[PDB]
Symmetry: C2
Subunit: 807 residues, 2 copies
């Protein structure tokens, strides 16, 4: 569970001291100086004579525009943290403001504690400026290499989904979430505002949304800066917020007047947030209007108003660098010098290059610091879940009645197990769902918890399994559900979410950014401790989207995840729950895992159980296993064909084909694949089957019929350098299907049992079996015609039960 | 359950027809005519010449002031019921407006269907005017003898508690509840207004409170008529009502315009109530402001404006009769004649004496009639409870280890039993409690239902066992709990309420009124089918109010109920649950019971269990038993003294005395009274023990030591004519006690085991035993001193178990 840090939700009960504001104004000046430093200077950080074009970087990389606004807010938030003792994480939406985030960590001391080479003197300062967005150095964004970051802000949109995920089950946590006014135009951001109806002010922390209304994005004004102020205020009132607006920097008002006005506005906002938290201890079923701050300042604030007779301060022109070169002419270098000199660094550093005591006296200490708070390194908070005994959830009937028994909905088993994990790990585990938790059969969790809902209630006849507090959250937004969970994990908790397989593609780009976050962490951030995995139940999959049709038929997230499977990062898991027992073995491995995205493809549709839990754990350990109890061949040499499957439905059809092939006395080895990456080149993936183990399972020389859940391309790409790879006949999804029957779905994708049988016969001897083949092909048309005439599948398809069952 | 009658919550969707409103004014006129007739005329209803002073009544008995106003309202309600098809019960707050309710029943034709002797002609009018409030006739109030009444309104103040009880689990029922402005000054009424936070507009019906603001009570203006209209409006709004005011009859405005205005306002109020009922099918968690009608009309409306130079219309002087006598002078007869003529009775009756057809054409028919509605005759709705199996609740351990076993809280047993009653009779059974349901140990109910609460919710940390709908209701008003349950039974449902014994006295007057309702019903109202019994758990009793003290120590309710045990009405049960097993037997008896007020005196303290369920049934069947197993005497001749207890605690002390009498070789009978009315004079009660059965149990010649739960005066008055009654030595509560120990409570009322032992010896041989008697007296003064010194009771009192226990 999240730790209670400092003295939360405390009013100052006194005006902000003048000496604190002089601190903030000094922070701002030194942060802006460090920020311009990182962008423009390779050397001479303090402009010791001689200071020349030689000291300026050859390529200017990084963003000024957003930065001075961020520096202003973080200065004021640091003052606020020290005065109040408030557990604070910032979300930097404008992640391209990376200079503001590195400057923060430097100034609060966490940069030097984390990277000892980066000292507090002229030497460290030189290295600090140079290394920014520099080969062999650190990124342009508020990346995971930055202490204080749980949000890089590279792909804009997720500032609010992450803020709200961070405060869930974290009642002492305050999150200023700084939202770009351009970011506000993305879809993900636009729905994120609505998150204030899915958090409770007693059991969760508090998000303060801050609209960085600097008027501009890259090359355009922003919608929200160019609509009437009355429309802007209404918009945020209508999303359940109390909008405050701060305007500064558009006139000659002196900086200390600005700090006084801001510090007083912030404390008035803070006082309302404390009354919300005090009220929540008595009444947490009435949703308050949560403050938010419209922060309207000029983009590029404090840079030169004009450069080359073009407007730069208060323009889109300041977004990257207001001055495109400092090397090209004397005059341009002069501009950089007067700009850097405008902050008066001579008042900010002592002789040996360190920031003066009186610049940092107001700052917070120890774990309250932005860069040192454990919420911003949630692995140090993360505990192992108390897991219940896996054996308690096993489908025992496989052992009694034998392989292929029953018509169980596999995902109900993961539902029972996940229920009891929530029972034993209250406040540490959450399920998210895009209005699909029940549809994906995880509703067993409602036995120990509720859907968290902090909008209106109306009736017990409709409002089932809802409470203002609960470990399940649903909104119809893959972006919200991915976003919430990501931040929950990054702040040291655990969970899972489910989606219909086709609509996983809505958050492909979020999976990408989270993969990339994890790739960077395992590679080069050993201080950033492991977080619980992002566990995604991919269900209501293509083969059984026969009730919804072509729109809902796309297993392609497999292809997308395969694009994050390099360099032995081991940050991606792709699992095919063959059955309920294999789903348990995968759930066990995923729930115990850290630093991964786990895709678990599992049918929710009635299907057979093939494996005992013991057999499934043994198979999962390797990723693929021969099924000796289903093989007719006793060794590889005897085997005329290999029948391999990956997925509940490809396994059903391959297992049905095996039975028809066994009636013709064919010698065939059956193979199951639960771990896609177990098939990956041994050269790329040191956890994959060895080429000797691969050859053992799939044989060295025989024809392999491979029925795959997703697109054949997936497998054909993975096994390019595997032994016997040219003898893989890989059938998968083929962009065929509609509103039809389960049999038609596999038929039309040439993965139905009758086709898989015919293909095996073709691969053994098309001549010897030309007749049986022809008969199979005629049966396929017969079986379709049956569906069209009757409106359900032929009973040969429907009523089949593995020969190996005793009924 | 309560039946769905007519087309409930229907909008009219058109103006009221002129024809309908002509109807209502005729109704008003004829009902004013029938009402003055009942008060003043013994003969010659239609004033056929000669009409003289000899057609008047000698004694003028009945109330006018309220009646014209009631007649106006009832008329307009009948128009409403007929146009809409609305399930409707009225509550006549000013029950002294009896003439209005009888007038109603005659006109709707339920009077002639119930009393075929009272026909629709001059002959029937003559019987009808005579019979009213007249020897060997019918009462002055809206008594139970009147179809449409479930509320006499003799004892003012219960109008709203009855209205709100009536609507509970009755979603089709509409209850216009007419409240006197004088009734409003009473406590029970003043608190009754708040019942709108304890009812739900989906699962319960609607009460429309109508304040009959006629300006006056008997001799005084009413407070609510002489405060500003602004305060009046704010008052009702503050109590969660939408107040509507109708002012009429204080100017020369024509009757037909008054009708037009009123019907408009009525249909506007009805449209609101329909919108409330429609909304509630979707949102029944948000409490609406319920409409209420301030009806401001002159008291005595349509009486002479003056009589003998005294203001009568719009004055307290019309309260009874504005015409003090119609026989004292001729002038006074003229005033009566003129008054009766101003309704133009020749337009209302045909020369036959039938009320014409144009007068009733507008009226409701069938079961929608105020008279015919089954909710006003609840017995016709009353089903038997599906009762669970009494054996399933038995304390089995008395068989195992013998009489006197355990320290169980008896009320917990009653509570598990009643829990299962609710579970099996959903929407048919209710528990009421004045914030004492848990304190009296009846909270097992919370397993299957909740406390009904329709004010605000705030937190799951305080709002336990509470839903907007449930079968348990709690307010800190004994008047509300008693009132709600009364109306719940009258409308043909079942329930129980519990109270601290002392505080049952708050509602003595309501026990009186309901007993009298039941007395009259069983005597001469066979058409009024039998209603479920008013079952009252009387716990937290005098002996174990050692924690609260003197104020909480009053078992008087027994004394009060005995004053309603006559004529073999059998409308009062007074039971003492000896233990949990006696309580189950007493409970089943009460829950199957009808047309009774059952008072069940049972302790909630840890006590011994004396009887199996079979010994309990047996003992309860007759209402007293000899405990063979307890007696040392094997017959009545051998016995030296009879020990008798009524009540758990007297039973304990008597049984402990019995063990000290046993260890001195004394021979004694042990008797237990469970049903107090079994000791009643067999002259007075044909269910009481016969003088033979009595003398058998209590011997005919032996001295009887009687430990009585309550005041000794009770038993001393009940047995005045019983065998061996002068030999009864009755110890009971004697207004001694404080905040003290359990022993000191019995000690200071001379009913402790040591005094009971001493008295048994004093009644055998004051002299032979003067050494044991003196020693017992010295231990009483020595165990009290132990308790003062150590603050718990002497181990001899505390650790005692009956002889006949243990493995
Ligand atoms: C999803 C996405 N689309 C496009 C971009 C490219 N992009 C990066 S910064 C930016 C403008 C952002 O402006 P705003 O949020 O207003 O930031 P600020 O003014 O604070 O720099 C754009 C289009 C992106 N990073 N992410
Ligand atoms: C508790 C109680 N106290 C006193 C009375 C005696 N009583 C009968 S009528 C009456 C006045 C009632 O006036 P209101 O309710 O305003 O009746 P209305 O004006 O409709 O005649 C009184 C004091 C009573 N019935 N009940
Ligand atoms: Ca911007
Ligand atoms: Ca009155």
């Amino acid at each position: 569970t999240s730790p209670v840090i400092g003295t939360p939700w405390k009013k100052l009960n006194a005006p902000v001291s003048e000496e604190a504001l002089e601190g903030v104004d000094k922070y701002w000046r030194v942060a802006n100086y460090l920020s311009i430093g990182q962008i423009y200077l390779r050397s001479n950080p303090l402009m010791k004579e001689p200071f020349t074009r030689e000291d300026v970087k050859h390529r200017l990389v990084g963003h000024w525009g957003t930065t001075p606004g961020l520096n202003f807010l973080i200065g004021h938030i640091n003052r606020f943290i020290a005065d109040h003792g408030q557990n604070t994480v910032i979300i930097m939406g404008p992640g391209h403001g990376g200079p503001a985030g590195t400057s923060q960590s430097y100034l609060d001391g966490t940069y030097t504690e984390t990277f000892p080479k980066i000292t507090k003197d002229e030497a460290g300062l030189q290295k600090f400026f140079r290394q920014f967005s520099y080969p062999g150095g650190i990124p342009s964004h508020f990346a995971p290499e930055t202490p204080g970051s749980i949000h890089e802000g590279g792909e804009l949109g997720y500032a609010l989904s992450h803020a709200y995920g961070a405060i869930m089950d974290n009642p002492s946590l305050f999150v200023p979430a700084i939202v770009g006014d351009g970011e506000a135009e993305t879809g993900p951001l636009a729905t994120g505002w609505q998150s204030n109806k899915l958090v409770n002010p007693r059991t969760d922390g508090i998000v303060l949304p801050i609209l960085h209304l600097n008027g501009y994005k890259i090359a355009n004004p922003t919608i929200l800066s160019r609509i009437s102020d009355e429309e802007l205020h209404e918009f945020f009132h209508g999303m359940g917020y109390e909008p405050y607006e701060f305007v500064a920097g558009f006139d000659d008002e002196d900086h200390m007047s600005i700090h006084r006005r801001f510090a007083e506005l912030w404390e008035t906002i803070w006082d309302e947030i404390c009354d919300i938290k005090a009220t929540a201890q008595t009444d947490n079923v009435h949703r308050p209007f949560y403050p938010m701050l419209i922060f309207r300042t000029p983009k590029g604030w404090t840079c030169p108003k004009y450069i080359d007779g073009k407007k730069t301060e208060g323009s889109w022109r300041s977004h990257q660098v207001p001055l495109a070169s400092a090397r090209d002419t004397e005059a341009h270098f002069e501009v950089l010098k007067n700009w850097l000199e405008s902050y008066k660094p001579e008042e900010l550093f002592d002789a040996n290059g360190a920031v003066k005591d009186d610049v940092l006296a107001f700052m917070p200490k120890g774990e309250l610091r932005i860069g040192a708070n454990p919420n911003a390194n949630g692995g140090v908070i993360r505990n192992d879940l108390k897991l219940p005994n896996l054996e308690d959830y096993e489908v025992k009937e496989v052992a009694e009645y034998g392989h292929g028994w029953g018509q169980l909905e596999a995902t109900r088993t993961l539902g029972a197990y996940t229920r009891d994990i929530i029972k034993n790990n209250p406040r540490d585990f959450r399920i998210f769902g895009p209005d699909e938790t029940a549809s994906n059969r995880l509703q067993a969790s409602y036995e120990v918890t509720n859907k968290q809902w902090d909008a209106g209630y109306i009736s017990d006849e409709v409002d089932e399994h809802m409470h203002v507090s609960g470990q399940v959250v649903e909104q119809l937004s893959e972006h919200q559900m991915e976003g919430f969970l990501e931040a929950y994990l990054l702040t040291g908790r655990h969970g899972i979410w489910s989606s219909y397989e086709s609509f996983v593609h809505v958050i492909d780009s979020m999976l990408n950014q989270h993969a990339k976050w994890l790739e960077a962490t395992v590679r080069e951030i050993p201080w950033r401790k492991p977080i619980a995995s992002m566990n995604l139940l991919v269900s209501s999959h293509v083969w059984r989207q026969d009730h919804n049709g072509f729109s809902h038929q796309d297993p392609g997230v497999t292809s997308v995840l395969l694009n994050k499977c390099f360099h032995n990062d081991h940050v991606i898991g792709i699992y095919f729950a063959t059955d309920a027992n294999m789903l348990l073995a995968i759930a066990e491995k995923c729930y115990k895992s850290t630093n991964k995205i786990n895709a678990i493809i599992a049918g929710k549709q009635p299907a057979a159980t093939w494996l005992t839990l013991d057999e499934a754990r043994a198979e999962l350990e390797k990723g693929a296993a021969a099924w000796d109890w289903a093989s007719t061949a006793k060794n590889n040499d005897e085997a005329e064909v290999v029948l391999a499957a990956a997925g509940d439905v490809p396994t059903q059809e391959i297992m049905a084909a095996s039975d028809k092939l066994k009636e013709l006395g064919v010698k065939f080895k059956v193979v199951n694949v639960a771990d896609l990456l177990s098939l990956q080149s041994a050269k790329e993936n040191d956890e994959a089957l060895t080429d000797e183990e691969f050859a053992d399972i799939f044989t060295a020389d025989k024809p392999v019929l491979f029925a795959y859940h997703s697109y054949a391309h997936d497998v054909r790409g993975l096994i390019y350098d595997r032994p016997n790879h040219d003898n893989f006949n890989v059938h998968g999804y083929e962009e065929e299907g509609s509103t039809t029957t389960p049999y038609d779905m596999v038929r039309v994708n040439r993965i139905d049992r009758y086709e898989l049988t015919a293909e095996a016969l073709r691969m053994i001897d098309a001549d010897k079996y030309a007749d049986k083949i022809d008969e199979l092909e005629k049966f396929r048309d017969e079986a379709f015609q049956f569906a069209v005439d009757n409106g359900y599948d032929h009973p040969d398809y429907t009523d089949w039960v593995y020969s190996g069952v005793n009924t």
